[PDB]
Ligand binder design. Structure first.
Ligand SMILES: [Ca+2]
Ligand SMILES: [Ca+2]
Length: 84
């Protein structure tokens, strides 16, 4: 049940995706300023608008977000995220 989150390039879980089980100070593999949908498999994750956990943040618990905006997150703006 280790914390896990999958981020996607396009809404509705499309495009490039990255399965994270550890903290990402750069938002993963080439997904900086591109994340549009997210799937929190387990744990609670915090998403930051700037790399290295900078700027405003949003905390998302287990569940699926076909559009990051449904989570109050601006589209194509996540730059880093970590478990909390
Ligand atoms: Ca996008
Ligand atoms: Ca950003």
């Amino acid at each position: 049940n280790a914390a896990e989150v999958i981020v996607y390039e396009h809404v509705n879980f499309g495009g490039k995706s990255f399965d994270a089980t550890s903290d990402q100070p750069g938002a993963g593999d080439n997904l900086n300023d591109k994340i549009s949908s997210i799937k929190v498999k387990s744990g609670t994750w915090r998403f930051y608008e700037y790399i290295n956990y900078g700027g405003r943040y949003w905390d998302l618990g287990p569940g699926e977000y076909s559009s990051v905006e449904s989570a109050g997150i601006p589209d194509n703006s996540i730059s880093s995220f970590r478990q909390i």
